[PDB]
Write a protein that binds this ligand. Structure first.
Ligand SMILES: Cc1cc2nc3c(=O)[nH]c(=O)nc-3n(C[C@H](O)[C@H](O)[C@H](O)COP(=O)(O)OP(=O)(O)OC[C@H]3O[C@@H](n4cnc5c(N)ncnc54)[C@H](O)[C@@H]3O)c2cc1C
Ligand SMILES: NC(=O)c1ccc[n+]([C@@H]2O[C@H](COP(=O)([O-])OP(=O)(O)OC[C@H]3O[C@@H](n4cnc5c(N)ncnc54)[C@H](OP(=O)(O)O)[C@@H]3O)[C@@H](O)[C@H]2O)c1
Ligand SMILES: Cc1cc2nc3c(=O)[nH]c(=O)nc-3n(C[C@H](O)[C@H](O)[C@H](O)COP(=O)(O)O)c2cc1C
Length: 608
């Protein structure tokens, strides 16, 4: 129950703002777009502000007309067909309210992903809803797809948005501007310098519950072992101690962690910029009105920002490269960086393959464009924030109330940029050894859950790391039997490359099968023969029986793992199963399946 800020309209009035951009974001993408749109306002004679809708009462939109040439934009991302956490209040309000928004001008840009059933659902709603309430759309709804390239969809929409804005309000197209000012600190107590904590100063040292995204709990790594047998890759199992954290969790929930960048990568960035990473400083908002005093916990050292608060590995967005251009002394290199923001032509094509496709991180760009030597402080201002990574808890709270398990594949690949890229969180996690190695973390509740009725059949499909949440399920179902409860069939459809290469939890799964915790352990080994053998091939094999459990046993279906292809193929296989046994046409099988998803009997936990 957050305490709302006062009317945003009155703040707009007091600060001569005429445009406000709200962001529905969870990973900071929509939040970046909002700030870019808000900043853009200046280049058109207007002045805007960015804002988290959760901190305000959107009912005040009805007051927006009181401002001449006022306008509100919504950059909303979608999550499982739902609004982001910070946009829930707004969502619920849009449904219940009946307020008249006559005179209100708006525009919406949604951040979606096409390979989802509910693509840009939130943006579609906000856009349609504001109009029903009586507001008037000032520019078409933007439909951004992260499946293709979201950054590009945004550029295209944006490039057309402002001209429309200008034409309607009749404003002219009226300049590198810093958002913060640098303040070095030659001397000051070490007790007031942030060293990586995410919120309250010294919150990592002095831990006080409850713990969450703002006040993560530093859990000790009690176990970290290699799960796979072979050496092709590195899959690992970690156990985090959460005793005395008061944290509650259930199988199906996710555990997030705040990682630390590679120190060598941090040191190189400083070295190539001739900067002293150990300088203590702060970046204070040049706009004293905003509640955002700094871009990250300050005061702090550059080293610390680059290590715990900044994203130095994902490809830089076009606006960041656009601003850096000024710092490239070699003409041709300044030109390339400047054109990265293009909505077409060689500039766009160059950005797409040389930066995105090749996965060049900031350091790589600084090395391939040697004339580019920006001042460290302005760089830290442009870089996006370092995000937490989520992992499907691999343990059951019934069996391990004080411990959270993680099952992850360490990311490390050859990038077309020529260098080897390392995953921020997994590299960091992998290096944690039980001593007091700690991991900042918090739990996030999910809807991925075992059936309430212990007798309800369970069908789990989780190839590769998709097995994670299922180890928790199996433990819990095994615990239920020990507890004298009556458990229905528990079926696992797992998959890996080779039984002697990356068969995760081989020994543990064998045990559960032996004791009957698992009614069936169906494993598809994709590479032990010439043709591929996948989990869906096993589902098809056991189609008759699966149908029986589904249509007559009320079994719950669970799919975890890769969302690009595996989840879809598994889904298609279930369509064919229903269609054959119902029986019914494909179209009716798709409806039947989707229904199971709404009635909570077909759940997902996939990612990319
Ligand atoms: C809800 C949810 C549940 C998840 N559960 C788990 C889980 O239980 N176990 C688990 O292992 N992961 C899981 N993940 C993934 C996890 O959150 C991280 O994305 C993953 O561990 C990699 O993070 P990282 O920081 O190590 O790598 P990052 O530094 O975040 O890099 C990730 C990016 O590297 C790029 N990349 C990876 N390989 C290549 C390549 N070969 N070529 C080009 N680009 C590539 C991709 O853009 C990828 O997005 C889950 C994610 C979500 C959202
Ligand atoms: O990440 P991670 O390590 O968990 O994944 P991963 O190890 O790359 O994949 C786990 C298993 O899923 C298989 N697979 C690949 N594509 C699939 C699909 N289209 N449908 C069903 N299974 C598929 C993989 O086989 P292949 O990698 O041999 O295709 C492998 O056997
Ligand atoms: C767990 C998860 C669930 C998602 N669910 C959806 C979804 O239902 N629909 C959709 O269009 N996009 C979905 N996406 C994609 C995001 O909408 C897209 O990546 C967006 O750019 C994220 O913006 P943010 O960083 O501002 O939250 C999902 C992404 C993740 C990681």
């Amino acid at each position: 129950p957050p305490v709302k800020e006062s009317s945003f309209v009155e703040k707009m009035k007091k600060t001569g703002r005429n445009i406000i951009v709200f962001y529905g974001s969870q990973t900071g993408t929509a939040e970046e777009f909002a700030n870019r749109l808000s900043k853009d306002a200046h280049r058109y004679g207007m002045r805007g502000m960015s804002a988290d809708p959760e901190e305000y009462d959107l009912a005040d939109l009805s007051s927006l007309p009181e401002i001449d040439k006022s306008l509100v934009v919504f950059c909303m991302a979608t999550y499982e067909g739902d609004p982001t956490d910070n946009a829930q209040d707004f969502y619920d309000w849009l449904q219940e309210t009946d307020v008249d928004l006559t005179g209100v001008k708006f525009a919406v840009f949604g951040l979606g992903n096409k390979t989802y059933e509910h693509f840009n659902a939130m943006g579609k709603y906000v856009d349609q809803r504001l109009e029903q309430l009586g507001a008037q759309r000032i520019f078409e709804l933007g439909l951004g797809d992260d499946d293709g390239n979201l950054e590009e969809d945004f550029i295209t929409w944006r490039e057309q948005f402002w001209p429309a804005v200008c034409e309607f309000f009749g404003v002219e197209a009226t300049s590198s501007i810093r958002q913060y000012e640098l303040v070095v600190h030659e001397d000051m107590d070490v007790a007031k310098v942030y060293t990586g904590e995410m919120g309250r100063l010294k919150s990592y040292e002095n831990q006080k519950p409850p713990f969450d995204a703002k006040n993560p709990f530093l859990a000790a790594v009690t176990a970290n072992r290699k799960l796979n047998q072979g050496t092709e890759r590195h899959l690992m199992h970690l156990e985090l101690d959460i005793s005395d954290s008061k944290i509650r969790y259930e199988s199906g929930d996710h555990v997030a962690v705040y990682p630390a960048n590679d120190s060598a990568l941090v040191n190189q960035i400083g070295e190539i910029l001739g900067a002293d990473l150990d300088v203590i400083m702060s970046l204070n908002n040049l706009d004293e009105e905003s509640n955002k005093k700094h871009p990250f916990p300050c005061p702090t050292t550059y080293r610390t920002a680059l290590t715990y608060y900044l994203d130095i590995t994902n490809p830089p967005r076009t606006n960041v490269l656009y601003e850096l251009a000024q710092y490239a002394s070699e003409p041709s290199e300044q030109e390339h960086l400047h054109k990265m923001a293009s909505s077409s032509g060689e500039g766009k094509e160059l950005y797409l393959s040389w930066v995105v496709e090749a996965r060049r991180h900031i350091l790589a760009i600084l090395q391939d464009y040697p004339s580019l030597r920006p001042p460290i402080d302005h760089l830290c201002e442009l870089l996006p924030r370092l995000q937490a990574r989520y992992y499907s808890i691999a343990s059951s709270s019934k069996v391990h109330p004080n411990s959270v398990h993680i099952c992850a594949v360490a990311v490390e690949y050859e990038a077309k940029s020529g260098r080897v890229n390392k995953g921020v969180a997994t590299s960091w996690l992998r290096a944690k050894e039980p001593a007091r190695a700690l991991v900042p973390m918090f739990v996030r509740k999910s809807q991925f859950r075992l059936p309430f009725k212990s007798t309800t059949p369970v069908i789990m499909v989780g190839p590769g790391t998709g097995i994670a949440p299922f180890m928790g399920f199996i433990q819990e179902r095994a615990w239920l039997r020990e507890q004298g409860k009556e458990v229905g069939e528990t079926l696992l459809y797992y998959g890996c490359r080779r039984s002697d290469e990356d068969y995760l939890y081989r020994e543990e799964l064998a045990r559960f099968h032996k004791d009957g915790a698992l009614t069936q352990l169906n494993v598809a080994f994709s590479r032990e023969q010439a043709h591929k053998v996948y989990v869906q091939h096993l589902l098809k094999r056991d189609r008759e029986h699966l149908w029986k459990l589904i249509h007559e046993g009320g079994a719950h279906i669970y799919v975890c793992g890769d969302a690009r292809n595996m989840a879809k193929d598994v889904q298609n296989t279930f369509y064919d199963i229903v269609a054959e046994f119902g029986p019914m046409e494909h179209t009716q099988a798709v409806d039947y399946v989707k229904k199971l998803m709404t009635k909570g009997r077909y759940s997902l936990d996939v990612w990319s």
